[PDB]
Amino acid sequence: MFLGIRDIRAAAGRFALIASVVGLITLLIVMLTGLTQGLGKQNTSAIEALAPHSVVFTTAGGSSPEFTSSEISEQQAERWKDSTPLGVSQTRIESDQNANTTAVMGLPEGTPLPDSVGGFIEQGALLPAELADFLHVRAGDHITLGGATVTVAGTVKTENYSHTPVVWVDTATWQLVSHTKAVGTVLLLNQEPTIQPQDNEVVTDLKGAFQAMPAYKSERSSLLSMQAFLYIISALVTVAFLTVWTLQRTRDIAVLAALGASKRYLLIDALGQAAIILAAGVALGAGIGALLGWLIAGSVPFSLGWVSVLGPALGIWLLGLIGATIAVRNVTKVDPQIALGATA
Amino acid sequence: MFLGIRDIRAAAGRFALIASVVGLITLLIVMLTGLTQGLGKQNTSAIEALAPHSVVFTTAGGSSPEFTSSEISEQQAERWKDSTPLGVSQTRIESDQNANTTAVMGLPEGTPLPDSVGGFIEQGALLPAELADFLHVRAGDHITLGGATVTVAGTVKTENYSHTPVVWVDTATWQLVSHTKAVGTVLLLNQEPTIQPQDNEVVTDLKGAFQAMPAYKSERSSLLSMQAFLYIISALVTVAFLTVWTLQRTRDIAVLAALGASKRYLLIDALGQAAIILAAGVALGAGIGALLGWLIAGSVPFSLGWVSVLGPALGIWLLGLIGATIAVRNVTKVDPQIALGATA
Amino acid sequence: AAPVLSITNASVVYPDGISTVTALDSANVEIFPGELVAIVGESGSGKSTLLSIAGFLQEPTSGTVTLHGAEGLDATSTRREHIGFVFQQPNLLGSLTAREQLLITDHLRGIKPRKDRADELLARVGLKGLGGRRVAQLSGGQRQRVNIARALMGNPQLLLADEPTSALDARLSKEIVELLRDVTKEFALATLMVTHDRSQLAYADRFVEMADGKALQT
Amino acid sequence: AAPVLSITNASVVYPDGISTVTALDSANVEIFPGELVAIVGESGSGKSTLLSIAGFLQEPTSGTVTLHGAEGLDATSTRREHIGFVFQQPNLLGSLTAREQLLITDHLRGIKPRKDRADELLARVGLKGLGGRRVAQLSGGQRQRVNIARALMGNPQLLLADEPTSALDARLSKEIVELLRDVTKEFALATLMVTHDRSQLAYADRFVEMADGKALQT
Ligand SMILES: Nc1ncnc2c1ncn2[C@@H]1O[C@H](COP(=O)(O)OP(=O)(O)NP(=O)(O)O)[C@@H](O)[C@H]1O
Ligand SMILES: Nc1ncnc2c1ncn2[C@@H]1O[C@H](COP(=O)(O)OP(=O)(O)NP(=O)(O)O)[C@@H](O)[C@H]1O
Ligand SMILES: CCCCCCCCCCCC
Ligand SMILES: CCCCCCCCCCCC
Ligand SMILES: [Mg+2]
Ligand SMILES: [Mg+2]
């Protein structure tokens, strides 16, 4: 580690240059990851916001649960205690001056809404502010929702189902606009099911509940493809590139080898140096990630946890160390006389 | 160019390694570009497929045209000759065994459909094969479309509006399912408007017609952000990285400078070499792009033209040459005695 | 006869962190055509520093250096057209062959490389048949003479040789300095040649001895 | 007295594309403690090739080289613990100071660098007060003696010096070879020393002269 750490003292300019390249790539991952995780929540942010533990569906013939084909009968609702019935519909919303199709979620009156969304379920419809502005309506107006006249009870913030903002209505209203005697589409369990379900019922955890959203499956393919190519290419770009960088030391490694440096000494020196520079690069790249990302998450959907900033960061940190290992190995492999020859 | 081209002869291994890094980055761009251009056509592929030149909307108070609020009256249709009325609706499709919300487009009977889609407009509904399988229906069955019983006339391939596959129906049917006396939502012009529109009409070219789709504007933000960060980061990663690469020649450039090489000679040599290696890297990176991309465009939406494969390719080719220019300049800037000193 | 090179009252001062080091102190050197001036002195007395400014590798920190018949030219064009360098270390480009080490100087001087000129000069320094060697396949002294041959490849008027026989046995080192003076005499060259082998002064018309950066009285 | 190093019937053959070059041909060398054996010969006769296998920088293509008291060790560990190299070129690591050029050998040999040992050895080769210099601030001969001092930093039993005075004036080169023999005698070293300065044979107990890769009769 003796030579390794002073190579940095002696040309901080070129080590800043190299840390930039690592930070730039870490930054590319963290924003592209958070930008596509944002696109994913265009289908799922509403149900996650409600934070259910398990969620009961309804099927026939043991099929896959589908949000478009599940209904909770009123007797079904009285059975499962500690449960809240949720209605999910997509329907036409129509004001005097404009219209749209939007997602309508229905809960029993007085249900506290997730803090991601305004306040409490009231009688009538709670519109996202952006949908209210689009329709040019305020609290008090009338709209047509699913062919039915509904009163705008107030505005709230936006959560999403199947790429539309969600309008929040009381179960009786949701029944009216979706034309059904059912009290909901699923039942939200906030603790964990203590009772077992029948042959046509199916309990699912929140992860699998998205498998039941059609807009989700038919695009989850496209998002995984992006996150796949991004990491695969990044990995190879990073590995290949730490090799090209470490190779610029072949000659001083060759000289140390000639004097008697063991390959362990040389590899420790090499990744000791690489560990320091890569640490800086990913730390700042992930730093500028969170700040830039938090800064932009008001105008563009940008979801990003902490396994998605530090997950990539250490991913690059070790991928870079193997790239450095590749280089040091291809020099120490050879008798030192040849390594001293490949240098001028 | 004398030294430059034989540096390649003398270490083809390390020049393959460096071309890989360029190709890997070009490949990252070409697939991520084509994967997000695919996500864009989830809202737009249907209307593009119909290939209109201009498209007439209807507004009130000179507002922005919206697909959700435009209607073409039957008199409006007889006015504009050479025009075809297109109805666009989102509604609930319901079979015996399942249901969904989907986009329904309406055209006059017998209208040839774009070859991207099956055959001709027939009376009834033409379903995409994937929607038909989802609903478990075939040609001949009945479905409920917008609360109305419609006969499945046959299946076709999939084009998209607002993230759903498009069901194709005759104008009379589209009128029935969308509950309107209007004959369409817009009028498609395949040549170019020879007549002028009124105060509440608005003519738009196909580009602007997407501004009228709500699902498009509220996500066009997220896709531009991705294509922005990808190119910005890529540019900087490429520039910074050709500098780190060219810098591995500081010393032989220093020796040529000492003997009398002009800076033009040295820069020509440097980018002559860089031009060759970058050309290889982007050519293969864009090559593996089109093949890998064409190979995957059956399971995942992947749209990609030729300005989106060769646009990026030359973008990297010149960005890399400036990176090489940066390096050669920071060596030739100095009196050669100092450059020979910074080398051991 | 006007001088080919005038080093008029020249100095080089380097910063040693807080202090400073005076590598060369008030050098006054003037060389005329056909002269071969040797330069003697202990390791670190300033011999290469004197050639570095003689060769326009750096501008002096005080005083001036003028190659006449090249005034009105920048440092780089002056080196290219009028000066030949035998660096202390061989300074061979890593990917070229011995033959090409010479040829590339033709390339940078903007004329078509003369392939036959190079193997003659390689033969003269005792390296016939070694033109294809890469730097790795050459010995310390073989490299040095490729260095030497490269300096004679152009048509300079000033030849700067920096201990060109350090890696040479007694017999070959003598042939190299016979080679150097012969071309000096034949082409009316101004040559300065640093050497630690003081026997070689017999081939020099004059010599400058140096200690602590200064030229001494001779 | 058993030999420290036995080069028993050793050869090195390199491929020259289609043909092959025999750099060293049937070398038979055996050196005992306290011996300083000089090695003479023309540029390209095989002098450094002989030291390259003597120093386990490469295995010979035919025949064997044995350092005894280190049998049962790989080439690398043998160099680290028992051999000191004065390379023909200085081979200084770019980012270290002269002082650290010595210290790092302590580091690779797994012991805490001895800071005072280094400035003494630097002073002995005539470089007192230059320990802070970087390679760029050192002259061709100053670098060479940093190279030299680095070889004496350990406790080898075999010292291989490859023209260690090439870049030295007459006065300093003599002090370096007095330095080399003195440590040879004091520590019962086996030293081989290539040189073109045949006057230096007076400090050698024996010498091997070489031509075309072979040792000659002496
Ligand atoms: N890798 C190599 N490939 C082919 N030939 C080589 C190679 N290395 C050395 N030679 C030749 O081997 C011969 C002797 O090599 P070497 O031992 O380095 O010379 P030397 O005795 O040390 N003389 P010098 O270095 O000039 O003082 C030379 O003619 C070289 O051209
Ligand atoms: N960049 C530098 N910074 C500080 N000191 C320097 C620098 N370069 C050279 N020196 C010192 O300048 C003095 C003479 O330099 P130099 O001209 O290279 O020696 P020389 O006469 O060529 N002798 P030698 O190379 O050993 O045969 C030496 O003491 C150097 O330590
Ligand atoms: C005495 C030599 C010590 C060298 C210490 C410099 C290391 C600085 C590394 C900082 C990297 C962020
Ligand atoms: C005689 C020297 C000519 C060297 C020609 C080798 C250049 C090959 C470049 C191929 C890059 C794809
Ligand atoms: Mg010198
Ligand atoms: Mg040698």
| Residue-by-residue DSSP string for B149-214 | EEEEEEEE---EETTEEEEEEEHHHHHHHHT-S-SBSEEEESS---S---SSEEEEEHHHHHHT-H
Q: Tell me the best of B1, B3, B5 to mutate to test the pocket of ligand 4, counting ligand atoms within 8 Å of each CB and taking the most.
A: B5
Our CA-based measurement puts residue A255 at a distance from the nearest CA of chain C, in whole angstroms, of 15
Q: Which residues surround ligand 6, an ion (CB under 5 A)?
A: C 139-140; D 48, 88
Name the residue of chain A whose CA is nearest to C143's CA.
A344
Q: Which residues of D touch A272 (CB under 8 A)?
A: none
Q: Enumerate residues 6+ apart whose C-beta is below 8 A from A322.
A: A239, A242
Cβ of residue C19 lying under 6 Å from some atom of ligand 2: no
| C-alpha span between D78 and A293 (Å, rounded) | 55
According to DSSP, the β-strands at D190-194 and D36-41 are parallel
Report the binding-site residues of B: 219
Q: Tokens at residue A271, please? A: 């990744």
Q: How far apart are CA B316 and CA C38, in angstroms?
A: 54
- Rounded CA separation B93/B100 (Å): 5
Q: Whose CA is nearest to atom 19 of ligand 1?
A: D44
Domain final residue, candidates A212, A235, A251: A212
Instruction: For residues D163 and D177, give the distance between their C-alpha atoms in angstroms, rounded to a whole number.
Output: 10
**CB distance A16 to A155 below 8 Å:** no
Domain stops at, among A212, A239, A254: A212
Q: Please, which residues bridge with residue A107 across strands? A: A170
C17 touches chain A (CB under 8 A): no
**Residues of chain B that touch chain C, judged by Cβ-Cβ distance less than 8 Å:** 2-3, 6-7, 9-11, 252, 255-263, 265, 335-338, 340
Name which residue sits closest to atom 8 of ligand 3, judged by CA: A9
Question: Which residues fall within 8 angstroms of residue D136, CB to CB, at 6 or more apart?
Answer: B341, B342, B344
The tally of domains found in chain A comes to 2
Identity (one letter) of the amino acid at A221?
Answer: S
DSSP 8-state symbol, A299 = T
* Pairing between β-strand C214-215 and β-strand C206-211 as defined by DSSP bridges: antiparallel
Find the B254 Cα to ligand 2 centroid distance in Å: 19
From A179, A212, A245, the end of a domain falls on A212
Which residues have CB under 8 Å from B65's CB, separation 6+?
A: B57, B58, B59, B202, B204, B208, B209, B211, B212
**Cα D216 to Cα A246: distance, rounded to the nearest angstrom:** 45
Nearest chain B residue to C101, by CA: B3
CA B193 to chain centre: 27
Q: Which residues of B touch A92 (CB under 8 A)?
A: 90-91
Does the beta carbon of D24 lie inside 6 Å of ligand 1? no
Question: Side-chain half-sphere of D126: how many Cα atoms within 13 Å?
Answer: 22
Q: Are residues A165 and A278 in the same domain?
A: no
Contact B337 C58 (CB under 8 A): yes
**Same domain, yes or no, for B186 and B252?**
no
Do B202 and B223 lie in a common domain? Answer: no
Q: Which residues contact C153 (CB under 8 A, 6 or more apart)?
A: C84, C102, C105, C106, C117, C118, C121
Query: Measured between alpha carbons, how far is B142 from C15 in angstroms, rounded to an integer?
Result: 92
B9 CB under 6 A from ligand 4?
yes
Where is D198: in which H helix or E strand?
A: none
C158-162 β-sheet, strand order: C83-86, C158-162, C190-194, C36-41, C206-211, C214-215
Contact: D43, C168; criterion CB under 8 Å: yes
Same domain, B74 and B157: yes
Q: Do A25 and A126 belong to one domain?
A: no
Residue D139 in contact with partner chain C when CB distance is under 8 A: yes
CA-based nearest distance B221→chain D, Å: 49
B31: containing domain: 2-42+218-342
The answer to whether the CB of D42 falls within 8 A of the CB of D212 is: no
Helix (H) or strand (E) holding D25: strand D19-31
Residues of the binding site of D for Mn(2+): 30, 48, 88, 163, 167, 196
Substitution target in A6, A15, A21 with the highest count of B β-carbons within 10 Å is: A21
Q: Give the nearest chain D residue to C44 (CA atoms).
A: D139
Spatial distance between the Cα atoms of A322 and A331, rounded to a whole number of angstroms: 15
CB-nearest partner of B300 from A17, A97, A221: A221
Distance from C-alpha of A159 to C-alpha of A116, rounded to nearest angstrom? 7
Tell me the binding residues of A. Answer: 219
Instruction: Tell me the three state secondary structure of residue C22.
Output: strand
b/e map C202-218, b = 16+ CB within 10 Å: ebbbebbbbeebebeee
CB of C132 shorter than 6 A to ligand 1: no
Residues B160 and B237 in one domain: no
Q: Nearest CA of chain D to the CA of A303: how many Å?
A: 45
Give the technique used to solve this structure.
X-ray
Same domain, A233 and A188: no
User: Which chains lie within 8 Å of chain B at 3 or more CB pairs, if any?
Assistant: A, C, D
User: In angstroms, how far is the first alpha carbon of chain A from the final one?
Assistant: 25
Ligand 1 pocket: which of D7, D12, D14 to mutate (most atoms <8 Å of CB)? Answer: D14
Tokens of A268: 């420790």
Residues of C with Cβ-Cβ distance to B255 under 8 angstroms? 91, 93
**Residue B257 to residues C93, C174, C199, C203, Cα–Cα distance (Å):** 12, 30, 34, 31
> Are residue A75 and residue A199 in the same domain, yes or no?
yes
Q: Is D129 exposed, middle or buried (0-12, 13-18, 19+ CB in 10 A)?
A: exposed
Backbone angles phi, psi at D147, to 5 degrees: -50, -50
Contact status, residue A27 vs residue A313, Cβ threshold 8 Å? no
Statement to judge: residues B207 and B273 lie in one domain: no
> B53 with B190, same domain?
yes
Nearest CA in chain D to B337: D136
- Cα torsion through C89, C94, C99, C101, rounded to 10: -60
Q: Kindly state whether residues B73 and B176 are assigned to the same domain.
A: yes
The secondary structure of residue B113, as a DSSP letter, is P
**What span, in angstroms and rounded, lies between the C-alpha atoms of C95 and C92?**
9
Verify whether the Cβ–Cβ distance A252 to D94 is below 8 Å: yes
Give the minimum alpha-carbon distance from B244 to chain D in angstroms, rounded to a whole number. 18
Closest C-alpha among C18, C93, C23, C14 to residue C51: C23
* 8 Å CB contact between A30 and A22: no
Contact at 8 Å (CB) between A138 and A132? Answer: yes
**Which protein residue has the closest C-alpha to ligand 4 atom 1?**
B6
CB contact under 8 A, A69 and B243: no
Nearest 5°: the CA angle B328, A338, C141 is 80
* Nearest by Cα to B114 from B157, B57, B81: B157
> Which ligand has the minimum distance to the alpha carbon of residue C44?
2
d(CA D51, CA D88): 10
- At C147, which helix (H) or strand (E)? helix C140-151
With left for phi above 0 and alpha for psi between -120 and 50, is residue C142 left, alpha or beta?
Answer: alpha
C137 is in an annotated binding site: yes
The distance from CA A128 to its chain's CA centroid, rounded to whole angstroms, is 22
Ligand nearest to the CA of D143: 2
- Residue from C83, C58, D173, A133 nearest B254 by CA: C58
Tokens representing residue D78 in the block: 């043998």
Question: Which of C95, C152, C162 to mutate: most B Cβ within 10 Å?
Answer: C95
- Cα angle value A281/A284/A287 (rounded, 5°): 145
Mark whether A317 and A180 lie in a shared domain: no
List the resolution, Å. 2.9
Residue of C181, C197, C156 whose CA lies nearest to C55: C156
Q: Give the chain C residue nearest A337 (alpha carbons).
A: C136
